[PDB]
């Protein structure tokens, strides 16, 4: 037994593309 | 030229903590926080167990978005906790393979992937981002053939 953890299941709003973070970071 | 950042080893106790004036590992500027989301997006792309699962569609047709979602759920630790360790992020990857991929990763291959996300914060803490840009430039050498072929013409 143990804690339920923070483990999510699935989403597409928080996801990060290799470019969606580069077009703002580069 | 250059060399790999790791081969199997990295650390076994890596972690980060916020300042006493803060409530999360999030940056003071949204312009600087961009370096961090880019950096994690590059380390999750180097994990082997997840890469094979999207190529074999073990998560269905939605696995192509579950791929980019795995860095998005780890980035949220830094936005809501004032301290995070490699053990926190590793469980966030191990469960992300079992929650819909039906795949266990007891090979500990997620360990070196978690320790890399921790060091993205250490570099962004003093405005450094050289490895975050490097992995982003080295990532494109196979997107020009594994997604859309292109005849090169580079000559410096």
Provide DSSP, A1-26. -----S-----SSS---TTTTHHHH-
b/e per residue, B69-92, with b = 16+ CB within 10 A? bbbbbbbebbeebeebbbebbbeb
Method of determination used here: NMR
Partners of residue A20 in chain B, C-beta under 8 Å: 37
Per the CB < 8 A criterion, the answer to whether B120 and B132 are in contact is: yes
Q: Which residue in chain B is spatially nearest to A14 when comparing CA positions?
A: B72
Per the CB < 8 A criterion, the answer to whether B139 and B42 are in contact is: yes
By residue count, chain B amounts to 156
- Which candidate in B69, B88, B90 is best for mutational testing of the A interface (most A CBs within 10 A)? B69
Q: Which of B110, B113, B4, B96 is nearest to B54 (CA)?
A: B96
DSSP state, residue B83:
E
Q: Which of A26, A1, A16 is nearest to B43 (CA)?
A: A16
Where helices occur in chain B by DSSP H, the ranges are 30-44, 48-55, 63-80, 86-94, 111-124, 130-138
Judge: A10–B35 Cβ closer than 8 Å, yes or no. Answer: no
The C-alpha atoms of residue B32 and residue B79 are separated, in whole angstroms, by: 14
Residue matched to tokens 């992300």:
B96
Q: Which residue in chain A is spatially nearest to B134 when comparing CA positions?
A: A26
């Amino acid at each position: 037994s143990g804690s339920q953890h923070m483990r999510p299941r699935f989403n597409r709003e928080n996801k990060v593309s290799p470019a969606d973070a580069a077009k703002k970071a580069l | 030229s250059g060399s790999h950042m790791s081969t199997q080893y990295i650390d076994e106790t890596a972690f980060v903590q916020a300042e006493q004036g803060k409530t999360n590992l999030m940056f003071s500027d949204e312009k600087q926080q961009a370096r961090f989301e880019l950096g994690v997006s590059m380390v999750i792309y180097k994990w082997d167990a997840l890469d094979v699962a999207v190529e074999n569609s073990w998560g269905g047709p939605d696995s192509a978005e579950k791929r980019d979602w795995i860095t998005g759920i780890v980035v949220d630790l830094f936005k809501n906790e004032k301290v995070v360790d490699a053990a926190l992020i590793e469980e966030t990857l191990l469960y992300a393979m079992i929650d819909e991929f039906e795949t266990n990763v007891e090979d500990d291959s997620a360990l070196p992937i978690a320790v890399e996300v921790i060091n993205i914060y250490n570099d962004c803490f003093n405005l450094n981002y050289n490895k975050v840009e490097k992995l982003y430039l080295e990532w494109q050498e196979k997107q020009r053939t594994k997604k859309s072929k292109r005849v090169v013409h580079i000559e410096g």
